[PDB]
A paper describes a structure:
Both [name] and [name] have a similar domain structure, with ankyrin repeats at the N-terminus and a SAM domain at the C-terminus. SAM domains consist of approximately 70 amino acids and adopt a globular structure generally containing a core of five α-helices.
We therefore used a strategy that has proven successful for a number of other SAM domain polymers, where we attempt to crystallize SAM domains with mutations in the polymer interface. We were able to obtain a crystal structure of the [name] mutant. As expected from the mutational studies described above, the [name] SAM domains associate via sequential interactions of ML and EH surfaces. The ML-surface, formed by residues spanning loop 2 through helix 4, is composed of a shallow hydrophobic patch (residues V32, I36, L40, and I48) flanked by negatively charged residues (D31, D33, D44, E47).
Author numbering: 2 to 68
Write the structure that this text describes.
Amino acid sequence: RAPYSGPQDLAALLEQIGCLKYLQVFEEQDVDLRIFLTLTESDLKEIGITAFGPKRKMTSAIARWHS
């Protein structure tokens, strides 16, 4: 199998956590994977992610893939 070291773009990360419905929010804010992986919960709020569920999934993903 092809070596893998995690999502290589934001859409891939969002698909992995079931959050593709937020892809456009990040595209309109011009936030790519590199920037996403630096975000705080406060940042996610500023971007437009207010619902508890998606915020929690995204903060968990950021912790997992930050590296």
